């Protein structure tokens, strides 16, 4: 297969006031956006060699008896509260992948859509302070990192799109934004059980099957082992790895506001018997945000689509990618 055109962008003047700098980023952004939906954010200003080393010390020392304890509902019926946040285990002879999710860290027992109990906000759950020192401290720490680099991010696409700079932003706010940090864990195996690799149609070995985000945009941080593809008009293509950057594209919600102008990208991830790394932020709204459809390429930018709100969004889209791809 031939290399996709993923371009490195430095995202460093969407942090400071230089309006003209600004639009020269977006425009960069528009062009990734219509071709095979994918950049490396570069000069992002976040330490992704710790988050990388602090992810390695929890996922090497956490016990069976731990994973249990923090364990989603999938996996344990005892949990019923925790559908999106917690622990997703390993099934050893049948499935390789494990990993750790969490919410807002300002969704406290004490907040109104906690206290309400609106679909797809959870309380967060923690390993023990005395197993994990620092552990809790450091990744709520990076949820603000990686939320700060996001808001300077949707500066950048709408002004790609003919917006003022806070068309998404104003929508994506501390106090309840519906986003998540996922911590992968893609483990080397051997022997590798073949019951955990899916074949496709033109017969590439796969860890996760061909699939759109469900977000507005994603935000990746990867190891340095060479294993996404992405379908274009000339067929599945490699994006290189780079454990410097963090790898940008678009979700279906953006799909839907733009009228396709700017495509969910079809991607998926190939089997390799490496030990590594995939770290998502998913940037969503909040459960009542409500943004207009509108179409760029038309001279009245009038769309005929219809608006949706982002929690009726979020929560069929989960369901549906379970259905169609697996429980994770
Ligand atoms: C290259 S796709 C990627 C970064 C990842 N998959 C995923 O993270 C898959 C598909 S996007 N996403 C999901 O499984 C959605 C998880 C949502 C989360 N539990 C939440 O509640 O917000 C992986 O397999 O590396
Ligand atoms: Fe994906």
């Not at 031939?2 to 960069?28: C, E, Y």
């Not at 934004?177 to 590798?192: F, G, K």
Request: glycine share 6%.
């Amino acid at each position: 297969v031939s290399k996709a055109n993923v371009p490195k962008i430095d995202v460093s003047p969407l942090f400071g006031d230089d309006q003209a700098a600004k639009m020269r980023v977006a425009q960069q952004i528009d062009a990734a956006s219509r071709d095979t939906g994918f950049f490396y954010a570069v000069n992002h200003g976040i330490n992704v060699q710790r988050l990388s080393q602090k992810t390695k010390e929890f996922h090497m020392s956490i016990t069976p008896e731990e994973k249990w304890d923090l364990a989603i509902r999938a996996y344990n019926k005892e949990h019923q509260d925790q559908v999106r946040a917690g622990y997703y285990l390993s099934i050893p002879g049948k499935k390789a992948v494990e990993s750790f999710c969490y919410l807002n860290p300002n969704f406290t027992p004490d907040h109104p859509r906690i206290q309400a109990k609106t679909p797809t906000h959870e309380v967060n759950v923690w390993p023990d302070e005395t197993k994990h020192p620092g552990f809790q401290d450091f990744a709520e720490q990076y949820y603000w990192d990686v939320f700060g680099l996001s808001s300077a991010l949707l500066k950048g696409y709408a002004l790609a799109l003919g917006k003022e700079e806070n068309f998404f932003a104003r929508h994506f706010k501390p106090d309840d934004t519906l986003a998540s940090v996922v911590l992968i864990r893609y483990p080397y195996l051997d022997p590798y059980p073949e019951a955990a690799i899916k074949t496709a149609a033109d017969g590439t070995k796969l860890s996760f099957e061909w699939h759109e985000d469900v977000s507005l945009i994603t935000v990746l941080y990867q190891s340095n082992v060479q294993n996404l593809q992405v379908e274009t008009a000339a067929g599945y293509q490699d994006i290189e790895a780079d454990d410097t950057g963090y790898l940008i594209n678009c979700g279906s919600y953006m799909a839907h506001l733009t009228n396709n102008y700017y495509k969910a990208p079809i991607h998926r991830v190939k089997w390799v018997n490496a030990e590594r790394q995939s770290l998502p932020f998913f940037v969503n709204l909040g459960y009542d945000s409500v943004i207009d459809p509108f179409d760029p390429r038309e001279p009245n930018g009038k769309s005929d689509r219809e608006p949706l709100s982002y929690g009726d969004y979020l929560q069929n889209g989960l369901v549906s990618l379970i259905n169609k791809n697996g429980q994770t």
